Automatic annotation (TrEMBL), chain B:
The name this protein goes by in its record: Ferulic acid esterase
Lineage summary: Bacteria, Bacillati, Bacillota, Bacilli, Lactobacillales
Species assigned in the record: Lentilactobacillus buchneri (Lactobacillus buchneri)
Binding site for Ca(2+) 2: 14, 76
Keyword Hydrolase: yes
Pfam families: Hydrolase_4
EC number(s) reported in the record: 3.1.1.73
Sorted UniProt keywords: Calcium, Hydrolase, Metal-binding
Length: 265, 260
């Protein structure tokens, strides 16, 4: 009889002087109950909803099945503090690690049943944070990892197909009307995706859609380094799961994974 | 200043929003801009657009409030159940709900729209004209009835398979038959022309919406201003056009909410 209904509430935390703003979906439960929890990392220049309600749908699916879902705007993204011109991926990694501690400190979170979910660059961040905080995560799920982003910018000299070679001349990179700064580009040399990601030995699921513009080889590279990886290739899935059939599939595959790793273990 | 999260219930749906409240004395109220996002968008709008506008207003003493419409973003409701009529109902109800908020000066209250949100704002303003100090519309998607009903496309994709498939696929969201059946109920320009307050429309020359729709609005506004931004696009998705849209809009709301 002890019972409260599910709730969608807004949460904040402070990391390195920035207020990060987020949404928590807490399942139905009893007072004092703690829930297995999935912390979601959005992609580059994205927001915590992700594209076309993607993380919202995933959050509510988890909530309806007894798994709490938490998702923040990264620093310099969405409603969190920070100018895009100051964004660096190293800062995103620092924040992702700090968000594990912040979210585990929330009273409704079962710290022993805590996982990461990523989309696009958020999957890359999740893979690196998982390697550096390996004992903190029950499992790791990565959608459409944008693990080519260093190769693309540093070797192909483009960012989502647009040249990066005018940054010094113009003073910035124009990302859909946001000003991306020199600091982002100068920091890229510091990132090592796969050497760090392979340190995580827990259950990993990667979901890759055959229409993803990221080459499939990057998902296979992850798998080479994972002791307990599963790679699901979704026929006609795309990078953001932007068809009704592939959206249903990504929600199902992910709920299946977190049921197995968080609810049945 | 402070960024607060607000909710209101309309027709059984909880709408979820963000309020940017300026710094002030305890008990102070502020002129307020209520922002309407576009079709299948969220209350941030694309690439931080509404967030940037909200903080610009907040820093200048104007409170900014922006909700996810029903069936959008974090608000309740499935996209398959979305209709424009219920967006118009929610937009009207949001005027009353936001005016009832503690920090909102109900006498200095305006609407801002982007894309379909501008169309909704134009209709609600025409129908609730005494409630609004001013109206600003970015990139109004006022061709949307013509495109769907006459050209049988929705952002370039056919709508002629909806009956057979049971839905329209909008970037992985199921849009339902209810949306299309409801389009016959919608009148843009005869509603919009009723509003006599100051209106500003900002239109970018790279907008895929034909410029003629903004001129049609102007023909019906007694106090309209049309700004054409060279090389601006529908979502203000270049750094120069983003600076321009924020500046033009701050200027308009300074004039209409801070200096009137």
């Amino acid at each position: 009889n002890l019972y409260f209904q599910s709730m969608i509430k807004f949460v904040t935390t402070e990391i390195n002087g920035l207020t990060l703003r987020g949404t928590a979906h807490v399942p139905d439960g009893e007072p004092g109950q703690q829930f297995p929890t999935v912390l979601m990392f959005h992609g580059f220049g994205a927001v915590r909803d992700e594209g076309f309600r993607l993380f919202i749908q995933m959050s509510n699916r988890l909530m309806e099945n007894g798994i709490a879902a938490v998702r923040f705007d990264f620093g310099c993204h969405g409603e969190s503090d920070g100018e895009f011109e100051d964004f660096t991926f190293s800062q995103e990694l620092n924040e992702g690690s700090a968000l594990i501690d912040a979210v585990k400190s929330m009273s409704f979170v079962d710290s022993t049943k805590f996982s990461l979910l990523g989309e696009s660059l958020g999957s890359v961040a999740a893979s690196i944070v998982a390697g550096k905080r390996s004992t903190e995560l029950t499992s790791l799920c990565m959608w459409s990892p944008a693990a080519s982003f260093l190769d693309e910018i540093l070797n192909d000299h483009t960012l989502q197909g647009k040249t990066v070679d005018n940054v010094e001349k113009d003073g910035y990179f124009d990302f859909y009307g946001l000003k991306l700064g020199k600091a982002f580009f100068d920091d890229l040399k510091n990132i090592n995706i796969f050497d760090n990601a392979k340190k995580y030995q827990g259950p990993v699921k990667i979901v890759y859609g055959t229409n993803d513009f990221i080459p499939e080889k990057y998902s296979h590279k992850y798998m080479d380094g994972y002791e307990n990886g599963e790679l699901v290739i979704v026929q006609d899935g795309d990078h953001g799961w932007q068809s009704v059939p592939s959206r249903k599939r990504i929600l199902d595959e992910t709920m299946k994974f977190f049921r197995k790793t968080l609810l049945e273990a």
